[PDB]
Design an enzyme around this catalytic site. Structure first.
Site, PDB file in Angstrom:
ATOM      1  N   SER A 189      18.126  19.061 -17.836  1.00 54.45           N
ATOM      2  CA  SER A 189      18.598  19.848 -16.710  1.00 54.45           C
ATOM      3  C   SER A 189      18.995  21.266 -17.125  1.00 54.45           C
ATOM      4  CB  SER A 189      19.799  19.129 -16.096  1.00 54.45           C
ATOM      5  OG  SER A 189      20.833  18.966 -17.056  1.00 54.45           O
ATOM      6  N   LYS A 211      19.824  17.472 -12.773  1.00 56.67           N
ATOM      7  CA  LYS A 211      18.656  16.585 -12.668  1.00 56.67           C
ATOM      8  C   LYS A 211      18.683  15.550 -13.790  1.00 56.67           C
ATOM      9  CE  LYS A 211      13.572  16.823 -12.238  1.00 56.67           C
ATOM     10  NZ  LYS A 211      13.086  16.803 -13.650  1.00 56.67           N
ATOM     11  N   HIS A 251       0.827  -1.218   0.000  1.00 55.82           N
ATOM     12  CA  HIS A 251       0.000   0.000   0.000  1.00 55.82           C
ATOM     13  C   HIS A 251       0.860   1.267   0.000  1.00 55.82           C
ATOM     14  CE1 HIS A 251      -3.545  -2.411   1.568  1.00 55.82           C
ATOM     15  NE2 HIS A 251      -2.535  -3.135   2.019  1.00 55.82           N
ATOM     16  N   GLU A 278      10.642   5.320 -18.335  1.00 59.02           N
ATOM     17  CA  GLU A 278       9.542   6.163 -18.791  1.00 59.02           C
ATOM     18  C   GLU A 278       9.031   5.805 -20.193  1.00 59.02           C
ATOM     19  OE1 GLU A 278      10.544  10.297 -18.281  1.00 59.02           O
ATOM     20  OE2 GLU A 278      10.208  10.131 -16.095  1.00 59.02           O
TER      21      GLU A 278
END
Ligand SMILES: [Ca+2]
Lengths: 390, 383, 390, 390
Positions: free
Chosen positions: C314, C320, C184, C327
């Site tokens: 980035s 980043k 969960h 993805e």
């Protein structure tokens, strides 16, 4: 223990039952799910038959004595005194005939009982001749649905507006609180928790609009279109009077379609509603996923918010608190996406002047509107109200 | 009226009822649909609580005097005496805990009554300590589901085999009859009606095979995996005993999963089934569509076959309701795919909506194949 | 600039082009996607006609000199030399007629050019009469697709296998790495990261298994079922010999269907493949979603793994590095789900002895098989292999 | 052959290319489909960069001489000069980073070529710092898509209005042609064929209506939201001066979003549009099937209409003419149904302040629009118009 005459033969209907053979035949053809059509459907099916007799009597087609007891028997059905007599499966063949007749026979028998006549005595009050006068399956059943849908739909709007509001209250309660804003699940700049919550409340707002907009194409009905939509001896006065009476008793801005063939064979006003409902459940699911991730932890999660405890914590493991209320919202979305695929499918199954796949379309439409209403009403109350920051 | 104690507050459980606070709390959290879980699921949920008791008595962790009455009262639920008592909504939060706990309480208080004890006394018979021993939500619930699926699924195989047979007989009956074969709905050359019917009958054969193959993966269960899959203190002997018990009382060749983590988080054994079901209903919807076109007319259609009159206008109601079950199923399958996609880490919390539809499909397909073969296929004739 | 005579009129075919007026008409009918049919289909669509020529000579239908060139000219198409000359839309009406005639014209016209004749002159070598001999659209086209699918399906199995090993390698590489096991999205019982990657390995095993079984029902071809399935002048010695070459030159253990009406009007083998593909990409999409969750952070995430950086996003926030490779998997996942829905609708759409929606079906089935092989290839090579524990 | 320096390594870009090392890295990570992003999106991607420059020059954040050459470069892209230089795959990770950076690099290296400088020399004009100034991937990429969708939607509406028109024309042409009106595929009452082509005409009107109302929520863009939606140095003058430039050149009533955080992370504009598209193709598929049933025959069918012949009579069955053009409609119908499911899954995927799955969403959304406009185009021109009664 009774007897009734059908072309297939004779079935032993109980003395209690207000339904006849036509409904018992549907119990044998379609023992598919076991379910019973939604109470709001039955109510709207009653509104339609009451509206019919009132109009039939006024144009001089229905005997004013017999009809007077059909109206009273119909008013009992509107108030839900007879929901245990509608026993046909929502998923069924015949494109609604069984649902239409289940109304016709229940109101037919109960109208005989009030005027001091026997049940099943169709010489006195026939479910086809008197209850189904100046109407086909292909306009009673649709119009009832249109009404059932709209009414459920208005309930859904309010319950969703109330939810939208309670996102905004929680939006300003967390205007100050500061969390890490994330794109690609990967840390960006810090962001106010309140902004995220307004973001949710603005899309819910945007759905509320879309859903409400899908009602207008439900106000146009085809009552009096009869079998196909040319009319086939359907009186222009009857149409007009029963339309106006359907608008009164139902309470929606109902009209009469400018082309009664178009209103009888096309099923696009339904796919439209279901499409608005899918996109709303797309959004709430994303949001439900956000809430579950933000509630994650306590020690190996995000620990940004705390959801009300609605189910007991783990036997001996401390800190265990499942986010069951968001979880259930994700699941209702999964129904609504599916429901919409069945509806899409059944709509494509249209052929010529009727779409005989309406029963499953309308089953899923009503179900969609119903489960959404309920989860929103249960989620907001037992979750959205209590949600606090960490 | 009674009073039972829960972390939220004190609810009033009818004395007639065997369910407790946990179930009524579920009623407020999840008044989603109003439906009840399938009897065969409850039976299966009752076959697990019995197998759980027998094993915990066999390894000594359960008191044999209390467990004796847990078993027998479980067998009552297996024979469907207490189907009214399971009143939680199939679509629910907590990944099935409200269903599992509904069994625990209904089994617990009926056990109490059979050894002459007060209902609600969880110091005497605790639903979570006694009935739910050596077992979590995340193995009791799945395993019940596995069993309930394979069981329901076997009725379908049979009912579809019968249906497949009665098509083969109709293919023989129309072996000589000649009709216009059509491609693009345009006239091709004449073929035999019997061929069309044998074409139908051969894919239904191909379906039955596809369906049946989706049982293999479903035999592998995770009873004793507890909450994650590592075991979490789990006695290896318990697993072995309870699995063997579950294989007996269910009736299926069940096995314990090689990787108990894999058997607890993944949910491909369920999407596999829905795929075999969907594909069957793609074949059957087509056929039904073909049957409706063959029955079209009498004056402005194709007038190739004559279906038995079932319902006053005559309309082909039986193939129609076949089409509509087919649409249901594709939609059920979209839901099952989503719920399966939504999985996270060691547990897919969306199982209840998945397990609600997967079951529904199986159930409604069965039911229509029955009615359709009977009130249609059998009586079909040439014009 | 050439000239050809069709029943609509005369179109100017460039002299460089090996197609004719049949193809150009389809280019005008269906300018829908603009895509070209997948190369393995062009390859397979040639293997068909090469075999059809070989056989038609062997039993005494085709001229041994003319067919000699059809066979050698078809040998070129198999090797990919004329992919530029297949310009008909993958989405097209006519149940794949235009795809068939594109191959017939491409080969015919090339055949003419080898045997010192002019392109366009079909009196000496016709697409319909010689190249398309003993075959209609409704056996040449599916049999091509069958051969295409199986070849593209063989690649996925290998690429999925290789992937599935490298999952197991990482699950041995993470046999010690401790982390929080979650339910969960909450904390539960500490587990090992290898135990997760093994679960990812073991399903992907079960995917390879499921996908493999779909091939059986594909080995039944319907070559020589011609127009309907009754044969319609189908010489049994042709069918046997044509199947032999087809099975031989394609690498697959191709059979002949026991019922030529069944194999011509049913499409369950495709829907069977598809649904296996959908189940696979469910699992992968889950695996992705986990990966991304594990790879979150650095300071407001789970930071359980570090994926190899494969790009910058980035510019706005320097440093980043996102989980792009998982993805893209999730996205190719979401295609296959859609692709599957089309294939379902397309199959259900079948009417009587032919399914006229096959092209959009196969277009989606082939794409699914391809985009899966591809993103699996790139995901394993540019993410899975270099995954490292935090 | 050129040399450009990246984190991974140093790729050999051909000198004639305008794309850089960011674009080739996307070519290796996501070799999924081989498709190119739609030219309207390319064009719309350009309109974004031009309005980004023009505003950046107006508030003096960018150098006027450099920006001049950035503007001239983008304007060439807007006319479709360099559609070949956009080689990235429409399905891709990094939430559209590659599609953005491929504009940045194609535009920059072209800008640099106009001002005499060497291609690749990012010291003068850096794709990252200059061409992409004041704009993130997360507002550059979607605002383009909004504009692209809105341009492509305005087309569908014309092509669908013109189609609806030609339905109404045939609807009057058949006003006095009598055929059998059928329910359940069984005979009901006689009916006028023209009344059917008006049910068709009208639903298609109601489709035009729904479809157009999806444009509103699409006019809100998020340009200036940058990374998260909280601006992150988003100069209010720049924002407004960008919006007005976008609305100008695109030709759309564009607005800046009232809540840029909501606009960046919610994706319900697209699901709303796809919802409409689907409903249209449901209605059109239904119609397309009626047309196939009416044209069935000639001796064992319904023979109610004749469709113009669009393909030659079969080799085996001389003079057999299939309803190909309505068949392709059904297939494009089936595409959309599935494309929607993808789009649905894509939106659901959404996590926090960004939806990283937009790439495969916009691919499908745009395709659905484009393929519909294209089948509507050929269908009205090659079928509906020449439709004749029996
Ligand atoms: Ca459903």
């Amino acid at each position: 223990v009774r007897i009734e005459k059908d072309f297939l033969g004779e079935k032993e209907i109980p003395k209690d039952a207000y339904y006849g053979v036509q409904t018992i035949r549907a119990t044998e053809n379609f023992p598919i799910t076991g379910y019973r059509i939604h109470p709001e459907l039955i109510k709207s099916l009653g509104i339609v038959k009451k509206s019919a007799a009132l109009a039939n009597m006024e144009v001089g087609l229905l005997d004013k004595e017999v009809g007077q007891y059909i109206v009273k028997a119909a008013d009992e059905v509107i108030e839900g005194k007879w929901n245990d007599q509608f026993i046909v499966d929502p998923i069924q063949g015949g494109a609604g005939t069984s649902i239409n007749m289940n109304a016709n026979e229940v109101i037919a028998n109960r109208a005989l009982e009030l005027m001091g006549e026997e049940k099943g005595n169709y010489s006195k009050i026939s479910p086809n001749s008197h209850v189904n006068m100046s109407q086909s399956t292909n306009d009673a059943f649709p119009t009832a649905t249109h009404i059932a849908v709209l009414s459920l739909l208005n309930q859904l709007i309010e319950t969703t507006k109330y939810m939208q509001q309670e996102f905004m209250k929680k939006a300003d309660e967390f205007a100050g609180v500061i969390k890490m804003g994330r794109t690609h699940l990967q840390d960006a700049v810090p962001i106010l928790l309140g902004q995220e919550f307004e973001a949710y409340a603005r899309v819910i707002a945007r759905d509320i609009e879309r859903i409400a907009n899908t009602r207008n194409n439900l106000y146009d009905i085809n009552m009096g279109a009869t079998a196909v939509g040319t009319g086939l001896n359907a009186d222009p006065e009857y149409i007009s009077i029963v339309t106006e009476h359907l608008a009164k008793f139902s309470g929606h801005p109902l009209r009469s379609a400018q082309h009664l063939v178009d209103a009888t064979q096309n099923t696009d006003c339904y796919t439209e509603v279901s499409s608005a409902l899918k996109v709303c459940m797309i959004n709430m699911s994303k949001i439900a996923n956000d809430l579950r991730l933000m509630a994650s932890g306590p020690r190996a999660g995000l620990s940004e918010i705390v959801l009300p405890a609605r189910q007991p914590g783990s036997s001996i493991m401390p800190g265990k608190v499942n986010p069951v209320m968001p979880e259930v919202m994700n699941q209702v979305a999964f129904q609504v996406f599916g429901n919409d695929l069945t509806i899409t499918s059944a709509s494509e199954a249209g052929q010529f002047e009727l779409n005989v796949m309406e029963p499953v379309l309308f089953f899923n439409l009503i179900q969609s509107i119903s489960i959404m209403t309920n989860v929103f009403k249960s989620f907001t109350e037992n979750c959205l109200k209590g949600i606090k920051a960490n």
